[PDB]
């Protein structure tokens, strides 16, 4: 499903992939690849099959990618009617049931006019003389883009800060922007109880103020619940995700949390759109407090860095390590690393080592005294730009 | 289905009871008690019936009562097998599949292996080389009678008192003995708005530590979440309680609480029960502070008294009153009161007025002076008896 990776020609290994027949949609790109334009006048795929498996394997080759659905009580839904009587377009319910006419399951060819009232008995929207009207909920969900199902849980869990909040460490403001677990990695609960020990008194107090048992972590799973599991995934989440924004190195990670570096970075940037989400949905919800707390955690959250090197990481040939270096150089602000020498920065960058050697996302490989350049040209762009 | 209470006339209203059409098993007993035995020589019924109602009226005497049912996941069951691999009669699983040979269910001509499972998860049982051995918990809820359904929460609420409890008033301690609402009352909010305000400090304190929540308390209704309701009507039950156990006016609490005298005995009585069964649930777990306080709160509820009058009420003529005026009479243990004068009692129980003319539970109406020398007649018995 990725970038296009053209190859004469493609093997594949078994028609059974992760313990599943693999599907014939991903089978008919899986192949699409293969023979390059121009270049190769032949194209062709081998797929491997052993045993009885090749019955299966083959029903792949004549068979057809399955018809499309509509997915559409229904979570997908539920979003679907809050997307349009939100925004103001359509108020009337009669209008309303227009809009499902419109959809994808109408042009196919009960329960619509039965899922309103599910947003009416959660504050989603007030009722009028019927004309529907939006609630202070309903529109911050709107503007920050969560699903409703969703945003009921963060709604009373963002709300129970206001009980008590930690600020000594980023701790429990990480904690209520970590996204959820899904199935981003496997945990260890043996490791996870040498690391529950060594955490310090500060990082201990968030974890009992937002449900995580001190006496039950790593402890009843040795020796063997779902609103309470998605608690202690959410709470390892917000672990890691600490380390990321120390600037950790990220093989340390490895061999202490024992997730690798590819689902680090599938997390850190899934986790930063959340931060970028909690965060305007406490904007258009009055709370000018949480708001301040959450506003810089979506850039640091992206790229692993601290609250000194924000405004450094702006240029975006600057990641994590190409700005911590350079930080360390005299250079704290974009603004005047914009007037930096540009052969000053070429010794500073040469250091560091953990002609198109150098690497910049976007432009594949570039040299030192390019790059470099570049890092001084863009942050000329950047000054005039915006104001 | 109470007491017989013999008429020679029977006369029933409608066939609708309650919006609902009345059931053969009650009609069966709701006639049979016309026509006394050895005075009456004919005994009649007569059911009222209206419009097209007769049709469904005269189906019940023409009825049967249906067939009796086992009503055996089931959560009925569950406390079976509970009730016999924990007594340590059966351990072996093929002797257990004998068991659900003997019980209603068989013998009226699956699940029951896969529902031992259930308890497995929920740490009431360890598993060992199957022979099953019960564990701590297992075994609490066994000698304390609670079905395994409700103990998941209690263990988990119990336990949640370990966190921070109060002891000015005894709310808290009420709290976790108030059973549960069921429909024992129809909710006044707007009523509970205005007590919810007059509340003192202390006692306001231990709705905030349960889940309770002032902000939304007697509002979010008004203008318009099943653990959160039987949360709040957990925190109403305990401020009736708790009035009841301050031996407040049964009739000042109908015109402050809603609710009538009816409904309030039908309570403590079944709230004193709780108590007991947590008492003796919290003495098998290993928690010996807990059941300290909540060892007198059985003694407290059923009779509505204070902590002074508790041994005064170990008579079993002494109810509410009849041990509070004799309390100011300068007698405060049994142990002396079981030395009164017999004339002196006469007088202060003549006073205090809210031949056979006072009442006891049990013997119908009494005079004063037989019941007065009934007060200290069981007072002797009890002295020698019990040591």
Redesign the interface.
Known sequence: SGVNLPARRVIIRTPIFGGRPLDILTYKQMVGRAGRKGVDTVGESILICKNSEKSKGIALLQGSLKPVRSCLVTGSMIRAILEIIVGGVASTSQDMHTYAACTFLAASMGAIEACVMWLL?N?FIQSTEKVYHPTHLGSATLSSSLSPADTLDIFADLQRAMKGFVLENDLHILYLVTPMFEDWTTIDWYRFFCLWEKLPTSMKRVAELVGVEEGFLAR?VKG?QHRQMAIHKRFFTSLVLLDLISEVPLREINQKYGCNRGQIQSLQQSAAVYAGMITVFSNRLGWHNMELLLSQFQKRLTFGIQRELCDLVRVSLLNAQRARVLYASGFHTVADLARANIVEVEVILKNAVPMRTIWVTGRKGLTEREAAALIVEEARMILQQDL
Chains 1, 2 share one sequence.
């Open positions: 008995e504050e009843c063997k």
